[PDB]
Assembly symmetry: C7
Homo-oligomer: 244 residues x 7
């Protein structure tokens, strides 16, 4: 119930990037500048190479984002991978054996543990590790959500821009016409990828805060709720009840 | 009998998409605009890049669908994968052990369970999980069915459209002829893929509602019907009868 | 003897399709229209893209089949896969254990089963499942056989056709010459693939109906014939006889 | 000694086909027609596409074979695979256990079988299955041998032929020069592949008929000769002799 | 806690290089020189081949780094791999058995080791191997950090440079215009890769020196801290305490 | 000591062929004819296709070898594979058990075999199988050695030759200039591959004849020398001696 | 400690070659000759094919090395693989059992070997096999080191050379301009690969001679030093000491 959130919050940005690259290769380069009819095949591939590199040199913040939208979406994916990567390396040895301990000792009682819960309750160290692995996960969803909302928010006739190559010794020339109407290509594919990654991230925002309500769902309030999720040995206690 | 429906309702849209891409690569780009004879090789590849991106900017709803038909068909495939993905994570631990429990205890009787069914009958919690995993599956087939029917319903001379590139600084020019008869290419392959995915989805519509008739097929009406499907231990009870 | 038929009736159409695609890639596009000498490299690739898409818009039934011959051959392959896919999911648990049952109980007799066959004989439920898995297999071979015969039956100078692109705003022009002699390319490879898939399917037509003669080959007439095919425990009964 | 023949009679045609395709891709298309200097890049690729398809429409039998030489060599490879595929599905269960039977019972004699051979001798059913799996293998080598000899027998200036494209509406024109000297390319690679597949198939022709001399090599004449080939339990009988 | 640092300090430079090459292939060559309109397709590919090779022959140190930025980033990755490669080949046999030794002998005490720690404390040979495997790791991070900071520090209009090909017999000619404004392409992708590899390496600099504080975290100060990390047998000593 | 010769006499020709193909693809076609400036792109690819096929039609023996040098080197590789392929199928069952026989019986003597060697000595059947598997291997090295020496022996300005295409209806024309200076490309790579495959095959020629001196190294002279190579049970007889 | 040297002395030349080929493919052919503007696309690809083959025909020794630098680096890699390949086939059976022999017999002493070392000391046969496997390894590093130093030593404007194609019937012509300024491309990548393979091979030269000091590190001087490297049974002798 909690591993499924951190697999569709990471796997879904990975799926859209791989689908974007099969669309990126099957059409061509992400820029396409309208070179004049006088240029050759190589000079017309110079302008598509210059203008794709010169979107950063001087709003300008809309144009800079379209180049790196697969990268920022990638960085927001591996940064959701690290709280589960740190959960398996910090709080996994402290939880694997102690669930095995209660799983074996409850067999011999029906064939101590009542004073186990009285002293494991007052320990505010492992519930703090649990919420900080999910509160950091919650805000990094919303930072990814506000970026995905901002990228869709522009949505304008903004992929079209005007660049020029007359910078170096090409300045003060008589062949280049000083203006090149370029246009980014993959914007419309990215605008739809910025929506279906936003609606999912909005629909998972009540679910991730539903895990932050473990009394309604101290350390006993954490520990009593984990035993019926990944441990099938509690299901034999219902076999005690159904016979009577 | 129920895993076979959710494998051919998901595997069949996956098969058509992979066959479409081998047809998409082996011919070329999905758009092909008739550029003039005056244009170069690069300006003629500008118009195929502009017009393929400018189908969304202003019926228009036929033309927008042809670009994203592999994507909408993909989204309708993974959304049929989630009710079985949630079935293996919610109702699978509550059903694996209790079928193992009756599978072992019925051996020692011929070598209790009669009062097991009297109290497992009045429990309207796990039949509700069963129908909601299939009723949500039923309507999401019909929403996929009505989209596939609507895409085939247009079928017109609608792939041909007229676009223009005179928008930015290319506006007020004297070389571009203001109109470009473009045409989408993969429409005829998609119209046949929208039929053989519709006839299958119509032919599976009585089957998925046939699973929604579990009395004619409460919790006992659910639980008595599962034991002769994935459990071979009931076949020894016929070995009790055939000897007598 | 019966798994070998449903592997060469499915594997043989799969082998011809994979061999066709290596021939399809190594030559080029399946259409090749004779564009005029006045056209550019891109306008000449427009006509090959328009005419390959416009074979369906208005005999015409010969020309429509040549585009989709790998698809119809593919659909006739997976539709032969489903009666064995349903045999392993419906009649496989009802037959795996009961063959194991006689395989063990006949050991202890020489170290009941004589009254086993007297009551398993009068059961017309599992022989009906056996013939319907093969009678449906028989007619779907003949429907595939009559399509393969019809595709070879045309064999004419029919790949050559005449198309025109003057439809949209390209209508009422003065550059396009109103007629384009196109020709499909992979027809001659497909005509030979339609023969060696027909001669095999004719030669397997007496074999598949030879399985439909199980008395000369009720439920006892089905059940007595399966035990000497996939079960090596009957071979020890000959070791009983050869010692005497 | 007999599995090695049916692996180099099948693996050797598979090896030459894979080596031919790496030579076929690394050079180009198998046809190369000398288009005029007036034609464009696309019209010159029309003639290479028309003439490669129009070798069948009206000696002509030399030219038709050069297109399908990888296919006929492939069909002669899988048709040598079927007598071993039928040997493992028909005569393999009748021979696996009975060799295991003598392999175990001869241990306890030195720790019946003398009357085993007196009644297994007069059985003309399994030697008939053995020779028909090899006599059918023998003639299908010679049919492959006479085709490989006939293909090498032409060896002429026969790849060069003259084709014309003036058939449809291209007939009665004033631009096409009515004759196109084409030439197949991979003929010289195929002529050498038709020799080293002929010398091997001639050198294996005495070996395959050497297996057809099982008295000099009834059912006892078959059965006594198999026990010292795939069965290492006969080697302990020499350990009986070497101690004495 | 220490294997996670040496996997994200090595895996993160490996991830950026693989992402850079998919961006390097999908656009084109890293150089793009503006050849004149008079040149052919091959002479214009000469200048892109000459100028990409002639960045080293005579500041110049900015231009030389842009060619080899994937190589220097690769060399700084495998040089972080060698202190863990030497740790598993030098100090791994001296630590695998002795942790197994205390793991077994502490079972039989509750079912010597108190004098074990009194003589294993005064041994300054294995703590010296531990710090030198991490102090060498610390400075090689900072040398990688100062290079990544220096590469981002230039960030100028420095990818644009001017080269000339008039060197050999091409000197004293009348066709080449003596100057070619070239421009490297992947600089802007590399400038962003030089930032997200710098912020991570700064944020890991307090963590790697936090491992260099093993008293606050002699040989006993090393050995007492390893037993509760990779060894689950110490968790049973808490099972001694929780029962009392 | 003898498996290492037949792995570097087979693996080394396989390694050079795979390295040749990566050089063959990365440059282009093996022929490159200097077509005139008047020809188009397709007619200039006709001459490279005609002349590459017409090296066999009429010294001429130098030019024919350069086309098929990867094939003749391949045929000399699989022909060194067959004496080890026949050794594992003819003399392997007669040698696996009898080495296992002495390996077990010598344990119980120290816990018959002295009369074993007196009768296994006079058997001139299995030493004859041993030398003929290596004498046939020896001469097939020298035939491969003399071909590799002859190919390097030409080494001339012999890749350059003159071909003409005026054969069929292209004869009696007025456009083709009757002579085409072609040149094979991969000759210089092949001349170096013909040296490092010759120096190895010369340096292995004393080693393969060193195996043909088994008295200085009858059947006892063969059998006594095999027991200390692949059998570790003879090493315990030194443990008998080192204790005394 | 000695397997790590022969894995980074072999794996490091393998890594640079694979990185060179990804740079070789992503740019183009290793030669790039400045063909005139009059030549076609095919004649300009003739000169790049002629001049790349004609670097050997007549300092000249610098130019010949640049073609075969990946091959000579490959030959120096597999020649470091053969002393470990011969170590596992000659001195591995004589060392696997005798280390197992002392590993078992020392258990029963604490639960002969003192006279084992007195007679295994005076045996100068297996130490001679040890040094010759490493002395041959030492000089073949230095021969690889002096070649790598010599290749970096040239480093000049030496990739640029002048070739001509007027050799055969192309001699005495009036179109070719008699001189072609070519230039090798991958030289600058190879000059950096010749440095980082030299600094490693210099830094491993004291390590490989450190293995040649086995008294300071006869047969006892060899045999006493191997037991604490790959054998964990000596670590129990410290468990004898730490208890006392």
């Amino acid at each position: 119930v909690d591993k499924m959130v951190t697999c569709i919050a990471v796997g879904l940005p990975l799926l859209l990037i791989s689908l974007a690259f099969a669309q990126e290769i099957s059409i061509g380069t992400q820029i396409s500048c309208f070179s004049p009819s006088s240029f050759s095949w190589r000079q017309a591939a110079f302008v598509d190479s210059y203008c794709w590199a010169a979107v950063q040199q001087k709003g300008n913040l809309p144009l800079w984002l379209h180049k790196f939208f697969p990268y920022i979406l990638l960085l927001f994916a591996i940064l959701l991978y690290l709280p589960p990567l740190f959960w398996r390396f910090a709080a996994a040895p402290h939880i694997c054996s102690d669930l095995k301990f209660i799983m074996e000792e409850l067999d011999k009682v029906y064939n101590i543990v009542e004073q186990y819960l009285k002293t494991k309750k007052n320990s505010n160290n492992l519930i703090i590790k649990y919420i900080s692995c999910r509160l950091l996960t919650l805000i990094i969803i919303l930072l990814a959500c506000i970026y995905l909302g901002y990228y869709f928010s522009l949505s304008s006739l903004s992929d079209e821009f005007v660049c020029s190559i007359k910078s170096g010794i090409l300045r003060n020339d008589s062949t280049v016409p000083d203006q090149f109407q370029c246009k980014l290509i993959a914007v419309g594919i990215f605008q739809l990828l910025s929506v279906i990654n936003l609606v999912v991230y909005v629909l998972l925002a009540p679910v991730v805060v539903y895990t932050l309500f473990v009394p309604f769902r101290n350390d006993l309030s954490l520990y009593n709720l984990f035993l019926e999720e990944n441990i099938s040995e509690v299901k034999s206690y219902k076999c005690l009840k159904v016979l009577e």
